[PDB]
């Protein structure tokens, strides 16, 4: 019946999302050499 | 009653905090670094690697190591009672006995290390940071001195708890490995460079934008475990390093959260990278290079430069290096620049 | 090449020329 | 709240949350039956590594 | 307001959700198997047992399909090579399916669990809140993990209901799915005894279900409650890590080092085979024996079978890897089609020279003929080095005894450079470089990246078992709230 | 008369990139530096290095990727001559020649000297102490001893340092093969300050979030600490600065010094027993292990 | 007490190794 | 019988205190305040934490925080949690032997 | 030879079933 | 029977606990005199 | 050479990455 | 407490164990009972894979 | 306080272990001349694991 | 096709150092 209080939202704001897009992006570039080879 | 007189005398106030912690901590450490230092001044590696390295030989400091076992022990933990010294304290010292004996105190010592950050977080009661940083330099140890020569043919490639013996397995990864060429070194030069340039730069701008420069600075009252980290002004250095390098940090928490995680995150890194490289999944060859190198010869980068160097420290190295697999290696094998 | 010769030292002595009067002078306003 | 059939049936097991022992219990129980198995495991260890060479025991793949 | 890194912790304070993730983890693990059992079903060879087994065609998850006695498909191919077998139902496809229909059958159950989450078990009735019997679950669940280790000892491992496991030889030439009977004794401590498992598992499974009928019956001490935190469920998970990486630790030892549990024939041979030359005593001990019966050198060497000679090879053992190699063996230097035979090697005097094996630790060797004693008496020359013995001037020949050349000499010195060059991987073996575009470049085994995998995740479990140890324990200072203080405390002022 | 606007752009501390004087040099010697680099790294031709006609390929379209690509060094041919376009007689002969090299690394030396003005200039008109400079000045200096001392002791520009992944491990390489780097306690003082500022930071950063429990700003810099520490004056920031910037200044000019051939004291045990045996030390095996690369690199 | 036990763990073999170390500086 | 942040020393400066016992009759805390006391106003010696000495005996705590502005050090903010009833005891009894002799009200809320 | 298998498991059931009439 | 390496195991084992013991009776010595 | 190396590349990039934005714009409608 | 969410264990109330009901005693009896003969039948089952 | 009971024993004992030539039997460290024996010029390595114990005394009556 | 995917992932990289300088997140305002 109750709509589950358990459940709270969740952030991401725009500068963690800009050092996970560096994190991502660099361990790509890091990465492509060797996925290449 | 039993328990507790025990409890509150070792959780006493001293000269040193001895918790729980420090059965395990104090013996293991003493005897990791007496072994070490009884191995430096007394015991020769004559019969394991065919070396000498003590103070009572003729080293100095730079040059003593107390060296692995020989290839022929295998795995052995080479206890004194032991099948291998049979209770005999100079065969044990001789086969590299004291090496495992380092090893083990330095895993047991390291534990209890790491059990007395756990301790003395939970009487002051702080959020156990810096025991979740020190379990870094524990991966390390485990990758490099324990997962790595389990994974090889014996203790013998191990580092040899000394100076020129631990130059020797840089050089040694160098050569057989391409140690430098894995991503996961690289990410760990990233981690501990990036964390030397951050340790730089916090120091640097913390003594300079500070809040009582030198004119009126009355000295305020010092808080031991504040880490005098409430003397400079957050909004003066954010506006110093958005208008030099265009990004900072907004926050005197975030800014020590990334300094805790960047060198702790390469340290990791690195561990993985010898976790892999102890069964030699090494990060040796790109193929299409290879196949472009073997292709026509004239095609050279420096890659292909630097496999023909771990060529030179291979064949060079190996027979003195190695001395159980007796390589015979005439001078028209050896690799030369003009051959 | 000549052309390029003369482009480059006309462009670096106008920046050396700008940093050095905008140390030497123009220090008030 | 729901009141299930299944819910029912394994109410008894969880039904004592919180319910403790007095004091010690069966601590030093658990003590010798903890050093019984860090002897049993350093007795596996070092037959494997064979620093405990068994009568009849061949460590090796026949 | 949760960060990206804590968005399970909803599930913390409410049990029916947290059977809803775990049923839909469960999903995904039974599908990945089922999953991977039709991809390597898709893509793997069975006409050649002898020569290309499942350890060369970089099949994971089939070796333990095979272990514990799933031999043969319904296409009508067997593991061991029969090639018309009446498997049953449980074949690999059949298994195959069973994960995947279990697969979508834990999936809907996980969306009951995930819509139906109030119901009353997780509740109790005196305090509103939700709460769970933890000393009491463990004691159900140890005795279930106790009577089903019982039952996989007594009646799987035994044959009394059910095939046996794998056991080979101790050179892995021939190995099926045998019934093995438990071995009490000290031989039950041999991790190379295949009884020593099935003594094991009555054994852990009869001491388990004692274990869990004395949690059922005995509540635990108030010291090592508040000790140990009784109460959160994050001291379960804190010590569930613990034991997991201790049992990953040992499946990547057991994999690296060899046990019964992890026999060649599906796994491949170890790295310390090579590194004590395991297969060559034997081919010398079967030669020689051969030989003092009055037979000539080919009738020696050819009575040698060509999977005893493929053991003896080093793009077989594991040690010889790369980390961004991909792929099975196969595409590592080919796929193997005839043993070429056994190159002995002459020195124009008719003195036999001896080529020096490869390690497993170097990318490449140089090619060096020595004696029986010791002296070097030829080598092949870096590029251009003054040769003082090289080949032509000692004058090298290469003969081969057994095998597919079998009494071919070959006196043409590149030939013999090429053929020592590949004498110094071991055992000399013809190549299908086409049909996968193989390189020469070798890869690892499924043993090598099972112990890979599995050290490395242990490692990581290392620091997930820190990290929820110090959130534990350390949790009215994470959180501010203590765990014994009530979450409603009136204000009373001062 | 607009000239004052200009003026006071290039003084000005509220843009939101700060444009100093000595930035007028540094944006553009840094800009040329960095699309030359980007250029040069993609597409470039390749560079022969010795004498004789083997050139080294260091782009990435002619078969390389991340890791393996570099700008090459220039040539022997050339060593300590000036090198820009106008000096070459093709364009074609200037890329041969390895003329890149010399533009980038002459133009980011340039633009990191006056990025370290720029930080200088910014910390003068805040009005503050030099110590960001100071510090920044170990990565410059490490950066000068690589680049132009090492070349400028050893007589050409080939021997420096190339730009790119495995240019840096070969240039690594063969200073362990030429110097013996590792036991000369100059560059050992940098591993131990690279080494304790990476240690310091972990150390730092774990002991700071252990015991900072909530701030603000006003939109006043109020925190609120959790002290009291362990039982029985607070410059721990020049410490914590001081230790890896003075490590990487004596590693800096201990290369700077093993550019001129100037080897420190060599502890090499060379233990003869009276037979005429030899018994051999650790230092030994990495001897060997360095003849092992001389005679590779010829 | 708690002094003793530092200097009869640390005190003793120091002085120990370096009557052992001053006098290998006269061997060969 | 009286607070003090450093054995020996005796905090002149009393605080404001905020109970809140629990409905249940059991778990307690009491969230202290000292606006600029002492120990905060200069003496090197170190914190070891928060006691509370008597005649009974001493409670102990290690929740001790310190506020600080522009630098400067405020305010001090020591919370105590009781969660036992024999320790709630032990805490009011305190409370009424330290409110005896510096003055406080106890305005129950 | 003597069936105990067979006669152990009729034992073990219904012991097992007094396990979980105990719960 | 019992071979060399049982009898090193034993004696090992038995030195072992010999040494656990004697800290903890130590300490516990030390524990029960200093009672402030 | 690698074809699917590209693949596991655009992967490396393309499931981390819009599992970064999705989160974000989530979070602009909370806002 | 920065401007985020967390969450932690709901722990239930600790109290101790009285001495037993004889509901509770017969059920600890047939559960005593009932394993002593399973691990009896346990045994008898491995004497005869044996 | 004052604490001079035995420092130069210590020392003094310390330069009799290896004066008189102790450490070399204690540790098993070869002397300068026992390096290699009187006729060969191989190094006495440990070879097979379990014989190491009779190997380098195998070894020691070469001397 | 390698040389591209190297060149734009670092190109990425090159625009992201200019929506995290410029278009940076304005501080929480109380
Ligand atoms: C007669 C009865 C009987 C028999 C014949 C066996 C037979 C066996 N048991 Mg079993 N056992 C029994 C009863 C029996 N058991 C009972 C009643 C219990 C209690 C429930 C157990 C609990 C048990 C455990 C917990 C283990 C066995 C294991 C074994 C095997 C040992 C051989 C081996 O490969 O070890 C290999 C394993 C080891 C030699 C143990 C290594 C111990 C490590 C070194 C401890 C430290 C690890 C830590 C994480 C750090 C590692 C650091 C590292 C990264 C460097 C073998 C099948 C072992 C097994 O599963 O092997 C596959 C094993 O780990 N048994
Ligand atoms: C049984 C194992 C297990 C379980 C059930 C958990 C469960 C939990 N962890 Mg713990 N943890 C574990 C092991 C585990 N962890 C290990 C091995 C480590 C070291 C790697 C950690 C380190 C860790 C930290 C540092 C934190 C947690 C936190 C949490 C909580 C929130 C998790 C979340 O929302 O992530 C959300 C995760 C994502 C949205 C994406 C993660 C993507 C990863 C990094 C890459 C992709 C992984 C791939 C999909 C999985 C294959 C796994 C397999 C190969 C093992 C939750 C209670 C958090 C916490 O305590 O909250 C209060 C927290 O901060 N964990
Ligand atoms: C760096 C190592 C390390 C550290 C700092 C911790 C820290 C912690 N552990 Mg973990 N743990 C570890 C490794 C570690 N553990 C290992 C290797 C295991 C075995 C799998 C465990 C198993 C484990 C469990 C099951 C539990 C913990 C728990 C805990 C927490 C409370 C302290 C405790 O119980 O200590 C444990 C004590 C030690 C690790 C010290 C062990 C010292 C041994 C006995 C010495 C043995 C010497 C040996 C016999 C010599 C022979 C060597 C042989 C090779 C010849 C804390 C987070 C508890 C927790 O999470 O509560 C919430 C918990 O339930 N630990
Ligand atoms: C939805 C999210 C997806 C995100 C993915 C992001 C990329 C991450 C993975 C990168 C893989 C690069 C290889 C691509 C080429 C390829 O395809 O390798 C395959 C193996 O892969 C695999 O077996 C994946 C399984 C890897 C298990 C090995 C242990 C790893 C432990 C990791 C520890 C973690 C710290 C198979 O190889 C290929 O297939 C072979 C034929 O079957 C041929 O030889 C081909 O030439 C080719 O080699
Ligand atoms: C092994 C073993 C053991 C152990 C033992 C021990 C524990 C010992 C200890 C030992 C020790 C504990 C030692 C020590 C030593 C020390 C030393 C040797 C020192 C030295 C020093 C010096 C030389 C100094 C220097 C300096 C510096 C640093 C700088 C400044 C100047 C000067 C000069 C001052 C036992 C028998 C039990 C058992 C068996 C095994
Ligand atoms: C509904 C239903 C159904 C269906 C079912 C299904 C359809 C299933 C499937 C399932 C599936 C199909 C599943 C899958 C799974 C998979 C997975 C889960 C995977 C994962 C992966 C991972 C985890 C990975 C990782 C990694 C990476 C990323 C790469 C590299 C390596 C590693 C490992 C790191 C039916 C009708 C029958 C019936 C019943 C109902
Ligand atoms: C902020 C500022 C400014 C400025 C800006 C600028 C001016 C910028 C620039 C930029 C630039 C102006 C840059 C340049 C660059 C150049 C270069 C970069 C050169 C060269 C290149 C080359 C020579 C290339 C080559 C090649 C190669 C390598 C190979 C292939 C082919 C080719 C030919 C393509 C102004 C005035 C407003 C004001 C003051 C401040
Ligand atoms: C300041 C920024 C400056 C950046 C300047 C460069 C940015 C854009 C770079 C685009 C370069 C594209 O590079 C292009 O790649 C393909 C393969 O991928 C190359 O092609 C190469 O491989 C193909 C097969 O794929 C072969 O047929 C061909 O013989 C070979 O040369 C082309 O020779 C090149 O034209
Ligand atoms: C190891 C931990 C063993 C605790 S054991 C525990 O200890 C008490 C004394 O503190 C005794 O009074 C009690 O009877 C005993 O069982
Ligand atoms: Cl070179
Ligand atoms: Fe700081």
Same mark, same amino acid.
């Given at each position: 019946m109750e709509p589950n209080p358990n459940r709270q939202p969740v952030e991401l704001n725009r500068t963690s999302l800009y050092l996970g897009l560096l994190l991502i992006l660099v361990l790509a570039l890091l990465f492509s050499s060797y996925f290449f080879n | 009653g039993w328990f507790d007189i025990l409890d509150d005398w070792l959780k006493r106030d001293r000269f040193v905090f001895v918790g729980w912690s420090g059965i395990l901590l104090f013996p293991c450490a003493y005897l990791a670094l007496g072994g070490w230092l009884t191995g430096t001044t007394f015991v020769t590696s004559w019969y394991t690697h065919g070396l000498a390295s003590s103070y009572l030989e003729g080293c100095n400091f730079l040059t003593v190591a107390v060296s692995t076992p020989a290839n022929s022990m295998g795995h052995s933990l080479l206890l004194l009672w032991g099948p291998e010294a049979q209770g005999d304290f100079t065969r044990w010292c001789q086969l590299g006995g004291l090496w495992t004996f380092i090893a083990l105190h330095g895993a047991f010592g390291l534990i209890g290390f790491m059990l007395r950050q756990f301790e003395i977080a939970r009487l002051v009661g702080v959020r156990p940071y810096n025991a979740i940083a020190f379990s870094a330099p524990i991966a390390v140890f485990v990758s490099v001195f324990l997962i790595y020569p389990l994974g090889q043919s014996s203790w013998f490639f191990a580092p040899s708890f000394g100076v020129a013996a631990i130059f020797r397995f840089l050089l040694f990864f160098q050569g057989?490995?391409?140690?430098?060429?894995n991503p996961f070194h690289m990410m760990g030069v990233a981690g501990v460079l990036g964390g030397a340039l951050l340790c730089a730069i916090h120091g640097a701008t913390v003594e300079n934008t500070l809040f009582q420069d030198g004119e009126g600075a009355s000295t305020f009252r010092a808080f031991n475990p504040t880490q005098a980290e409430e003397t400079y002004s957050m909004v003066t250095a954010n506006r110093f390093w958005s208008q030099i390098f265009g990004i900072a940090f907004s926050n005197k928490r975030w800014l020590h959260f990334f300094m805790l995680f960047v060198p702790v995150t390469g340290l990791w890194m690195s561990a993985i990278g010898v976790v892999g490289l102890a069964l030699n999944l090494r990060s040796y060859d790109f193929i299409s290079q290879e196949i472009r190198a073997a292709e026509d010869p004239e095609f050279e980068t420096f890659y292909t430069k630097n496999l023909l160097l771990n060529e030179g420290i291979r064949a060079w190295m190996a027979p003195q290096d190695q001395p159980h697999e007796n390589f015979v290696f005439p001078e028209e094998v050896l690799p030369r620049g003009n051959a | 090449m000549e052309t390029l010769k003369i482009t480059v030292y006309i462009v670096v002595t106008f920046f050396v020329l700008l940093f050095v009067f905008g140390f030497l002078s123009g220090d008030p306003a | 709240a729901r009141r299930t059939w299944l819910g029912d049936i394994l109410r008894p097991l969880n039904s004592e949350y919180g319910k403790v022992a007095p004091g010690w219990g069966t601590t030093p129980l658990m003590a010798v039956f903890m050093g019984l198995f860090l002897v049993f495991l350093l007795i596996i260890l070092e037959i494997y590594n064979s620093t405990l060479i068994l009568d009849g025991v061949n460590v090796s793949w026949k | 307001g949760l960060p990206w890194y804590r968005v399970?912790?909803? #599930?913390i304070n409410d049990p029916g959700r947290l059977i809803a993730a775990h049923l839909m983890h469960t999903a995904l693990v039974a599908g990945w198997a089922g999953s991977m059992a039709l991809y390597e079903l898709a893509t793997? !060879? +069975?006409? !050649? +047992?002898? #020569?290309?087994p499942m350890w060369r065609q970089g099949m994971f998850v089939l070796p333990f399909m095979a272990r514990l006695g799933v031999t043969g498909s319904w296409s009508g191919w067997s593991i061991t090579g029969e090639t018309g077998i009446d498997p049953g139902f449980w074949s690999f496809e059949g298994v195959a399916l069973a994960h995947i229909v279990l697969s979508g059958l834990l999936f809907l159950a996980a969306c009951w669990h995930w819509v139906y989450w109030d119901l009353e078990l997780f509740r109790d009735p005196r305090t509103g809140e939700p709460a769970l019997d933890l000393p009491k679950m463990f004691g159900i669940h140890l005795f279930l993990a106790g009577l089903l280790c019982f039952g996989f000892g007594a009646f799987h491992l035994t044959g009394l209901f059910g095939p046996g496991m794998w056991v080979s030889d101790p050179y892995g030439l021939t190995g099926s799915v045998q019934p093995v009977a438990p071995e009490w004794g000290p031989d039950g401590f041999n991790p190379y005894n295949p009884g020593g498992v099935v003594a094991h598992h009555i054994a852990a499974g009869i001491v388990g279900i004692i274990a869990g009928l004395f949690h059922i019956l005995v509540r635990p001490p108030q010291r090592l409650y508040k000790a140990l935190r009784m109460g959160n469920i994050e001291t379960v998970l804190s010590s569930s890590i613990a034991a997991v990486f201790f049992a990953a630790f040992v499946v990547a030892g057991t994999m690296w080092y060899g046990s019964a549990t992890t026999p060649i024939e599906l796994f491949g041979p170890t790295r310390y085979q090579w590194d004590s030359s395991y297969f060559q005593q034997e081919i010398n001990r079967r030669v020689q024996a051969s030989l003092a019966s009055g037979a000539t050198l080919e009738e020696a060497w050819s009575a040698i079978p060509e999977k005893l000679a493929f053991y003896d090879y080093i793009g077989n053992n594991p040690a010889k890897g790369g980390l961004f190699r991909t792929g099975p063996m196969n595409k590592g230097d080919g796929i193997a089609q005839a043993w070429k035979g056994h190159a002995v090697f002459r020195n124009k005097e008719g003195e036999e020279l001896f080529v020096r094996r490869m390690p497993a630790f170097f990318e490449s060797f140089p090619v060096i003929l020595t004696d029986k004693n010791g002296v070097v008496k030829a080598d092949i020359p870096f590029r251009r080095a003054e040769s003082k013995y090289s080949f032509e001037q000692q004058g090298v020949t290469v003969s081969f005894y057994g095998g597919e050349l079998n009494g071919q000499t070959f006196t043409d010195p590149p030939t013999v450079k090429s053929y020592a060059r590949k004498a110094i991987f071991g055992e000399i073996f013809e190549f299908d470089t086409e049909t996968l575009n193989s390189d020469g470049i070798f890869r690892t085994s499924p043993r090598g990246w099972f112990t890979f995998a599995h050290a490395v995740f242990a490692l990581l479990f290392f620091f997930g078992h820190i990290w929820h140890g110090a959130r534990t324990l350390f949790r009215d200072v994470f959180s501010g709230i203590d765990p014994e203080l009530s979450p409603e405390q009136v204000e009373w002022g001062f | 008369n607009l000239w004052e606007r200009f003026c006071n752009w290039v003084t000005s501390t509220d843009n939101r990139l700060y444009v100093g004087w000595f930035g007028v040099i540094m944006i553009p010697t840094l800009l040329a530096a960095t699309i030359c680099f980007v250029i040069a790294f993609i597409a470039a031709p390749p560079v022969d =290095?010795?004498? =004789?006609? @083997?050139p080294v390929s260091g782009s990435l379209l002619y078969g390389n990727n991340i890791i393996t690509g570099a700008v090459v060094p220039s040539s022997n041919a050339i060593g300590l001559h000036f090198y820009? =376009?106008? @000096?070459?007689?093709?364009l074609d002969e200037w890329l041969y020649n390895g003329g890149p090299y010399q533009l980038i690394i002459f133009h980011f030396l340039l633009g990191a000297s006056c990025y370290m003005g720029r930080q200088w200039e910014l910390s003068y008109r805040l009005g503050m102490r030099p110590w960001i400079c100071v510090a920044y000045s170990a990565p410059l200096a490490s950066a000068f001893a690589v680049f132009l001392i090492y070349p400028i002791g050893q007589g050409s520009f080939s021997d420096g340092m190339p730009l790119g992944i495995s240019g840096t491990f070969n240039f690594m390489i063969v200073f362990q093969a030429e110097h013996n780097i590792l036991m000369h306690p100059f560059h050992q003082l940098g591993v131990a300050g690279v080494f304790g500022g990476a240690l310091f930071c972990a150390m730092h950063g774990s002991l700071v979030t252990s015991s900072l429990i909530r701030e603000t700003t006003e939109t006043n810099i109020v925190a609120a600490h959790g002290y009291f520490g362990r039982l029985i004056s607070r410059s721990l920031h020049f410490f914590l600065a001081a230790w890896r910037v003075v490590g990487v200044w004596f590693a800096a000019l201990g290369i700077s010094t093993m550019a001129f051939n100037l080897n420190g004291f060599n502890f090499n045990h060379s233990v003869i027993d009276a037979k005429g045996n030899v018994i051999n030390t650790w230092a030994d095996i990495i001897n060997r292990a360095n003849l092992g690369m001389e005679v590779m690199h010829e | 007490t708690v002094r003793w036990v530092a200097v009869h763990t640390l005190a003793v073999p120091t002085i120990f190794f370096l009557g052992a170390i001053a006098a290998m500086q006269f061997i060969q | 019988a009286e607070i003090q942040f450093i054995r020996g020393i005796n905090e002149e400066v009393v605080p404001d205190v905020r109970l809140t016992r629990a409905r249940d009759g059991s778990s307690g805390q009491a969230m202290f305040y000292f606006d600029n006391p002492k120990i905060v106003q200069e003496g090197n010696l170190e914190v070891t934490g928060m006691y509370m000495v008597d005649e009974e005996g001493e409670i102990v705590t290690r929740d001790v925080n310190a506020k600080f502005i522009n630098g400067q050090p405020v305010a001090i903010e020591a919370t105590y949690t009781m969660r036992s009833p024999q320790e709630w005891d032990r805490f009011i009894r305190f409370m009424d032997r330290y409110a005896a002799s510096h003055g406080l009200g106890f305005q129950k809320s | 030879a003597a069936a105990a298998a067979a006669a152990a498991a009729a034992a073990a059931a219904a012991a097992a079933a007094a396990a979980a009439a105990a719960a | 029977t019992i071979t060399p390496s049982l009898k090193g195991f034993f004696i090992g084992l038995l030195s072992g606990a010999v040494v656990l013991g004697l800290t903890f009776a130590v300490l516990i010595a030390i524990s029960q005199i200093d009672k402030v | 050479v690698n074809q699917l190396g590209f693949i596991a590349t655009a992967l490396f990039v393309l499931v981390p990455s819009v599992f970064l934005i999705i989160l974000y714009v989530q979070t602009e409608s909370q806002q | 407490e920065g401007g985020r969410l967390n969450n932690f264990a709901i722990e239930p109330k600790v109290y101790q164990a009285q001495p037993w009901t004889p509901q509770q005693k017969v059920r600890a009896a047939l559960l005593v009972g009932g394993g002593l003969l399973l691990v009896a039948g346990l045994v008898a089952i491995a004497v005869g894979v044996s | 306080v004052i604490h001079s009971i035995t420092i130069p024993a210590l020392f003094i004992a310390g330069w009799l272990f290896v004066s008189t030539g102790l450490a070399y039997d204690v540790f098993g460290t070869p002397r300068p001349d026992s390096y290699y024996a009187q006729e060969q010029r191989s190094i006495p390595l440990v070879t097979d694991r379990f014989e190491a114990k009779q190997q380098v005394e195998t070894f020691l009556e070469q001397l | 096709m390698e040389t591209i995917t190297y060149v734009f992932i670092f190109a990425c990289i090159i625009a992201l150092f200019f929506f995290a300088i410029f278009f940076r997140e304005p501080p929480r305002i109380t």
């Open positions: - | 057989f490995h391409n140690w430098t060429l | - | - | 399970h912790t909803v #599930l793997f !060879d +069975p006409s !050649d +047992p002898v #020569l290309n | =290095i010795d004498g =004789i006609r @083997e820009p =376009i106008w @000096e070459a007689a093709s | - | - | - | - | - | - | - | -």
